[model samples]
Target: GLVVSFYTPATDGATFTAIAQRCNQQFGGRFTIAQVSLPRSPNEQRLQLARRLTGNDRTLDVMALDVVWTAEFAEAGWALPLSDDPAGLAENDAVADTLPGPLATAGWNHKLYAAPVTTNTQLLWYRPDLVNSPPTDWNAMIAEAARLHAAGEPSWIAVQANQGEGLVVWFNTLLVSAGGSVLSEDGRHVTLTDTPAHRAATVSALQILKSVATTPGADPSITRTEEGSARLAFEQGKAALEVNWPFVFASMLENAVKGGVPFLPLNRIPQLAGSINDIGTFTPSDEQFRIAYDASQQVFGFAPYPAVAPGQPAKVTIGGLNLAVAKTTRHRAEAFEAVRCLRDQHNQRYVSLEGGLPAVRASLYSDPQFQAKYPMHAIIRQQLTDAAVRPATPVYQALSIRLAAVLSPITEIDPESTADELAAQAQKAIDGMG
Candidate 1:
């Protein structure tokens, strides 16, 4: 006879209701689950919930949170600490199966606040035939892309530069690739300007983005692009390079196996020998090559995104959603039950397959069928090894809104001056939150 309202970003009512029914049955309780509708944009949901959590609204029992706010929510005490002490207050679940990156994202101060149900990272997608060896650093890649353009190829690169959270992610990816972090080592401070090394790193990061945008033959569409459409240009082969999530890799592989492109890269077929079954990702010859040339087939290559410096490892942004029980909830036990049930591997895999997100379990990537279906997941695993996280401050929502807008026009930014201004604005936002 307890009601637990789950606020989620689900647009499809029927699907969420079905999951609710399933949760109720499995947990075996008088749990009356009500779905609270949220805005389509994550930032909008964050703003709305921020008001409710801080203002003492007791209705929302559970919340679906973005990865960036673990620190904020935990710091604000808006979310209950996820633990399993006999008293129902300490995290005792053997979360060893959970991937390190996602687990880190959901945790703060040696305590976990949410169940990391899904995870995602961006990879550098390219055409192997056009460039036999991809560059290991940003400057080299830009140099290579420009070289291809000068030699009469589209050679365009697609990136997300729209004034939104994704822009923050794109900028952070560059920032982290150069060995910089959003916060100081302890996560207690913003490093945008306070840390001299951070400012140097910030300039390197900002200038690279500027170079990519101001450089000719870069995709004219990138300025207006978001995640949904950024990969489209790459699929059409108009852009020789792309940085995108792993969700689209399967679709790209399908075009290679079942369809055609202007010309397929047949040499990559042998690389698919280990995990592929009957599929459309690649080819074979009269004996070794199974399929003949098809003009409609497409080809793509996946790699760990290049670094900002020659010897440094590339560390891009990690993004996805997490589930937390609101601290204000009266039915804390029930909320945690729902949280745990939803995070079970069965449910996690189910939602992941339906949602096109990567499972949080490391073993899922190595599963034979998963590897067969998502051949690019191997590269995803590698990139996530060194993935970077965004700032985890309570002021992140407001901060991102300001930063995304201020940093929108990449070509107009002078990295040195911009870092000072960026640091000042970010710190100001943090102070205003108190």
Candidate 2:
């Protein structure tokens, strides 16, 4: 039997392994699917896969690629195009039911190169006890946070502004929300200074980023804060508002049961949580753990990612993983077959329900069990319907690296100069120069 290796990011849960085993059983001796787990950090996973694929390592057959890598991999000739494959992925319409956001991530140069699996987008998470209603836009949210600070409430706005991919995501979301884009639609040239409207939109996005960083309610360590610290700040009741991924809800529930930092009650000691290290001065109650678990359901509120301007839905940058058949594989046919099984509706539902990843399949959004488990499904579905994606370019990595570097230390941003600086840096990046 042919052995098809599927390289995926390490899952703390058993779902990926289970899916692989199921694919093997279905193959009935024609091929045995193996699950090869990579590092949890996406950057490390990319490095590992890139090194292997560069050498045309035969062990790399099916790869769980980051959504941003589709164009890069396709251009490098590392990933086999699904539409061009003899396996008939295109003929079968394997991705006919995928949601638009994930579907967009799976293609490059208008051809499908990968199959969409799970998808993710951030939402505005806040403490309902502190906020009477969710702020409709960035300015309103910042004003509310400042007001809470003046009143001596837990008022920090939690978000990922650190120097990494997360920072790029933040910039991309705000840039798109303000009707700007980092690159043109063709992904060949920089668009920040392409026109007066585009230049203004880019500057507006930078202004929003700087405003959040300079706000009185912003975490002081925002330059060092990524998703994990932002989640920690919110879960510990130090933040009145947060813009982050959906994982926060499950993490809060788990913390509630495990008697960890607990949730929301620490709001009483806002002074103790001014910094990440200061968060430890407060303690959680074991006796109240069960009660806290129930309280999370009541006090935690979520809404769509806030608009950059009033009266418009935010164009959030979508995040997710896709499965591509490696072009170097000896067993391309079997690898495609395995990818089909792994991303089928049944497996997608399992990953959604058990693993907490949102499904790429549109129908799952309305599934009774899925909606019941995720009460926030309606908001997530709405955000996904009209989300933005990272630029699809062979030079995306180079572009993001330079973009994030210029955009970091958010408080020091010069909206007036950053747009032109990015325009110059972006051109150099795509040209493969420093």
Candidate 3:
């Protein structure tokens, strides 16, 4: 069978190659995998996909698409509805068992456009030696940072608040924690500006900036790219907190092996109260002393933000790629078959053992042997259930770009000025898009 594949090169792509090779081995001559590399930028990826679809060029049979791009591809008829295939492989129980986060993005209007390949989510990495107890809420996090600062320790938190996709992801978590949704229930308009919840989230985020994190102007953009920088700082007895994905664990382990630090304990940030809930508590008084003393020794563990705070539900962004058959392909059946083979339980185990990111399949999370091989798998897997997708509109790419342009400049500006400018620019962009 003729099998054609198109994808970009990234850590995620490298992982997919391993899974694809295993599928080829299992299927023998029944499948032949061919791959074409696409450009890395989302805009470039979209342009290349469009050319393949309507530029009179024969495209590959399958495309490894970003989950957020599924809508654009589906709406443009550049993706075949996998559910339409009579073979029912798209709806197969084995494949359906993958997590809903990925499936939700890949499926449009009751049809599956792609198969979720792997997944990731943003998580807080902290040091247990310095922060014996993890902060239960944002307030606690700030208080801990203050304590560290008072003791003249290096910065307590390293956040990617600089303008870019990183800032959006980081701020979205803050918004969700503050009980705000990016889109309203009707999905008719963007609700980021002028909402109490959004304002609260911004304030909470600003507080972190004012107290704990390094501002964008204080550091270069390249600093954020170093996954090990925060870990290195923590290992060297510098910073105590950092935000990153699961891949950073490998770096932490490597650093430990290099005698950087031993057994660094990592945990997620706890939920915060009102926007300024910890205000008065920050003052130097006996009451503040008690609160600080208690926080200094808190235990670290992971917990999802409460959706409504105290009782509301919460969600996390499901990060990763999906596998979809290109509508331009001549070998749709072969491509569908390849997706099935790649998602098989045996092949998934190989992915798990190799420390590849988690697949959406729920069964993989339950595999004891796989878990034993990669102990940190549970944290990310659990996060996937609570994970969310970035904005799913065709215009989201532009929105993301505009947002980066607006907010990144604030990394160097004062938080208040930055917030005002970002709010203004973001509103203008949203209006322009409409």
Candidate 4:
């Protein structure tokens, strides 16, 4: 018998855990994975993992690594190489099997260190009842958001523009949409100050933030806000439009079922939802909540995040967790065997069905069952195809920290003036890390 543990962000994914346990059942007495869920916050999870991994704690067998951790871990040799031999990825074909953007996250130095289990990409969710049709581009969305502000709603847009990773993602989205990048493709040098495209990206990103930072439809606490708070604002009927992850659907659907928001029937339990649940003592949990304009109430529509202007295609910022075999593990062979079960297409499909992000398998987009379960599958598939990832560098942390520091105050920016200064400062960040 052997013990292999798989660590992840939260315990909320019940089906995810169930699938792992089923593998143990199938393996009989030969193997077991102790499923460990860290604190919900990314910082805490990163801190907790950093502590153990830095010490090469043997308990670290299999890991659900954030995409950004690939470079750090791979560079430090704390993670086993999952990509493949000297230079080939197509040989094993598993790591290369996922979408290019997601696969890129778990890769460093042109090699993979992990297998992407789930993937994320942003989408624009709008108040369909207020805005007749979704905007086809960024400019229209802004005008619509602003126009709706005076007549339809007080808040025009609910997006994560606070001083954090969300803002970093926002900047990357803006830069890529403006036809630029934060760092070179080689991941060695800063690209933010390199050309007219780069300068325009910096200016445009700041201008976009400034455009909404002090605007009526934006949350007044824009600088302090992040995903949770913004989601609250958007779902509270406070905004005309919002941009966010797929988890919103999961959260909304789960809440609808548990707290009575008119979700589709599940089974016999759903048949008795009226008598046994909604009307009587069927409260979901201590999770008591409501939103008149929430997506849970099913009045929401999904679209790709709009491009910078009329002609550009939106540049999506992709995210998700990857499974990396800890290099320190004693049971490397058996651990990945269990990991194979965890990341199997069946389990991956479960991740999709249970409100988790879609599996790394592209073919899942064509899955009829998934299409029926997730109405946004088609849109997600289309967006992920062209999505851009964070720079594949361990220095990304350093780069993002400085980006947030200088570029965070969206309202105070003048692209015409600070382009060179901002570019120089950006260049300094990567240099300092160098």
Q: What TM-score does each of the candidates earn?
A: 0.80, 0.88, 0.75, 0.86
lDDT of 1: 0.70
In the range 1-434, model 1's lDDT, one tens digit per residue, is 78788787754233345556677777567776776778866788787788889888887788878898888888888877787322473254426577888888898888898878678898777777677776777887888888888988767776655678877898899888776766766656778766678788888988998888777687665555344466667766787777777655644543444433444543346533432234322322223322322321234677777788778677889987777888778777777777666666665554544344677878777677556545567777877777888877767777888787778777677888888777777776677652
Error of 2 at 432 (Å): 2.6
User: Each model's number of backbone clashes?
Assistant: 13, 0, 15, 2
lDDT of 2: 0.79
lDDT of 3 at 370: 60
* Model 4 / residue 10 / CA error / Å: 2.3
Tens-place lDDT per residue, model 2, 339-406, is: 88888888887676545577888888878866766677898899988897888888888888899888
- Candidate 1 lDDT score at position 279: 30
Which model is ahead, 3 or 4, in terms of TM-score? Answer: 4
Candidate 2: pairs in clash: none
Candidate 4 or 1, higher TM-score: 4
Output the TM-score of candidate 3: 0.75
Task: Estimate, for each residue in 394-429, the C-alpha lDDT of model 3 and write its tens digit.
Answer: 556666777666555433435556555656655555
Better of 1 and 4 by lDDT: 1
Every candidate's lDDT: 0.70, 0.79, 0.58, 0.69
Error of 3 at 169 (Å): 0.5
Name the top lDDT candidate: 2
lDDT head-to-head 1 vs 3, winner = 1
